[PDB]
């Protein structure tokens, strides 16, 4: 894959989490 | 419904 | 998109809007998984049944939106299509199997806040993710009940279980197809609908923290119907496909 593929700006890059990605986290069991 | 883009792009 | 919810700005910078020249409207959603490469399903650009054949001159990619009717000056960019590319065993006929298409840019896109390209999965992380029970996330401008959103929606869906995919409709399915949804015994709803194919299905790694792409917005009959599922593609399965034609007509 691209070096920096799946890093959003907005978000990985800046250490933001969006609303619902922990949902995401929580499912992974 | 949807505004326009463009010309350069069409 | 029904029963999700309004985008972050930058939440989906990977989201590509496919994009009728004459007349304008939106064809479908798709993906940017390179500088000059986007994802998408066959079936938004070829399904001869209903006289759907599109070449590289009908269409427009958009990059970096967030609003579906406005021209998002100084935000998105809007690419040209250079060269189309159908997996050679796309089943239009029957059902869908290998719902796949990759569109080579006649140029780069440039990065920037808003757009930006998702992984795609190696065997180990498909292994790991694509398991009952754990949840992706779906994004798309399509519509809103079985009207039409301001701005791009998500929503958030478990897959689904192979037995109860097959379980919920008569159409055969493949090793190529995955489904997700929530069951009616579950509470939660939503899933994709008309206008949202083509775009992905993403899973956050856990490992590494970085969003792949593990599915591709193929079909559904109806939308959030109780019982059904959203049916996706394999991206993983179908990555061999992929390497080959970026390999051989990348530059
Ligand atoms: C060819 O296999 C098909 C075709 C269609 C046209 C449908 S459908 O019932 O019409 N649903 C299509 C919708 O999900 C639509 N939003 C996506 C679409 C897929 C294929 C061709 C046109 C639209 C289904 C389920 C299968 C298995
Ligand atoms: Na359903």
Same mark, same amino acid.
């Given at each position: 894959?691209?070096?920096?593929?799946?890093?959003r700006?907005?978000?990985?890059?800046?250490?933001?989490?969006?609303?619902?990605?922990?949902?995401?986290?929580?499912?992974?069991? | 419904?949807?505004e326009?883009?463009?010309?350069?792009?069409? | 998109?029904?029963? %999700?919810?309004?985008?972050?700005? %930058?939440?989906?910078?990977?989201?590509?809007?496919?994009?009728?020249?004459?007349?304008?409207?939106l064809?479908?959603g798709?993906?940017?998984?390179?500088?000059?490469?986007?994802?998408?399903?066959?079936?938004?650009?070829?399904?001869?049944?209903?006289?759907?054949?599109?070449?590289?001159?009908?269409?427009?990619?958009?990059?970096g939106?967030?609003?579906?009717?406005?021209?998002?000056?100084?935000?998105?960019?809007?690419?040209?299509?250079?060269?189309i590319?159908?997996?050679?065993?796309?089943?239009?006929?029957?059902n869908?199997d290998?719902?796949i298409?990759?569109?080579?840019?006649?140029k780069?896109?440039?990065?920037?806040?808003?757009?930006?390209?998702?992984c795609?999965?190696?065997?180990?992380?498909?292994?790991?993710?694509?398991?009952?029970?754990?949840?992706?996330?779906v994004?798309?401008?399509?519509?809103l009940?079985?009207?039409?959103?301001?701005?791009?929606?998500?929503?958030?869906?478990?897959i689904?279980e192979?037995?109860?995919?097959?379980?919920?409709?008569?159409?055969?399915?493949?090793?190529?197809?995955?489904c997700?949804?929530?069951?009616?015994?579950?509470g939660?709803?939503g899933?994709?609908?008309?206008?949202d194919?083509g775009?992905?299905?993403?899973?956050?790694?856990?490992?590494?923290?970085?969003?792949?792409?593990?599915?591709?917005?193929?079909?559904?009959?109806?939308?959030?119907?109780?019982?059904?599922?959203?049916?996706?593609?394999?991206?993983?399965?179908?990555?061999?496909?992929?390497?080959?034609?970026?390999?051989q007509?990348?530059?």
């Open positions: 894959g691209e070096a920096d593929c799946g890093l700006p907005l978000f990985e890059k800046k250490s933001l989490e969006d609303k619902t990605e922990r949902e995401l986290l929580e499912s992974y069991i | 419904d949807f326009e883009i463009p010309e350069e792009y069409l | 998109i029904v029963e %999700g919810s309004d985008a972050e700005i %930058g939440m989906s910078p990977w989201q590509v809007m496919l994009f009728r020249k004459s007349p304008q409207e064809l479908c798709a993906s940017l998984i390179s500088d000059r490469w986007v994802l998408t399903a066959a079936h938004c650009l070829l399904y001869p049944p209903w006289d759907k054949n599109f070449t590289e001159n009908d269409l427009l990619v958009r990059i939106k967030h609003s579906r009717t406005r021209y998002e000056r100084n935000i998105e960019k809007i690419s040209m299509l250079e060269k590319y159908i997996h050679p065993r796309y089943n239009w006929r029957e869908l290998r719902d298409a990759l569109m080579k840019l006649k780069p896109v440039a990065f920037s806040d808003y757009i930006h390209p998702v795609l999965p190696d065997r180990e992380t498909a292994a790991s993710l694509l398991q009952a029970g754990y949840k992706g996330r994004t798309g401008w399509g519509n009940k079985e009207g039409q959103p301001s701005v791009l929606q998500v929503v958030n869906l478990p689904v192979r037995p109860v995919c097959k379980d919920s409709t008569r159409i055969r399915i493949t090793d190529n197809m995955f997700a949804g929530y069951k009616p015994d579950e939660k709803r899933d994709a609908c008309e206008g194919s775009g992905p299905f993403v899973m956050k790694s856990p490992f590494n923290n970085r969003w792949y792409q593990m599915g591709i917005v193929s079909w559904g009959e109806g939308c959030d119907r109780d019982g059904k599922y959203g049916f996706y593609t394999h991206v993983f399965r179908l990555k061999k496909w992929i390497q080959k034609v970026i390999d007509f990348g530059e």
